[PDB]
Write a protein that binds this DNA or RNA. Structure first.
Length: 69
RNA sequence: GCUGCUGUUUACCAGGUCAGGUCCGAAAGGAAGCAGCCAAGGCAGCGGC
């Protein structure tokens, strides 16, 4: 379960925007996304790092909700 | 080395285009620009000089 699957699942348009600005490797192995890449992603989707963190955070609770079934 | 071809590889860090999204604007319209792609570079094989 990666950020691509999470993508298949108003504010939702801006969530796609963020993911739509990452590279394939990033969508597949989310943990490689540190500070520098977050900056690229945020500006790339006209967002704020915090928005990105908020998304990665959600995908996290989401991913964690998967590693339990 | 230079050059042609082929395979492969490369998040951002003054290449082109730019889905999505963003910014400015009452609007008409403008601006920047990630991913992708093209290009370019890296690692090599073969050929030409």
């Amino acid at each position: 379960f990666d950020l691509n699957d999470f993508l298949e699942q108003k504010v939702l348009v801006r969530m796609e925007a963020i993911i739509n600005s990452m590279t394939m490797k990033e969508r597949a192995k989310p943990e490689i996304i540190k500070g520098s890449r977050k900056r690229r992603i945020a500006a790339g989707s006209g967002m704020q790092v915090q928005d990105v963190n908020r998304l990665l955070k959600q995908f996290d609770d989401m991913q964690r909700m998967m590693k339990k079934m």
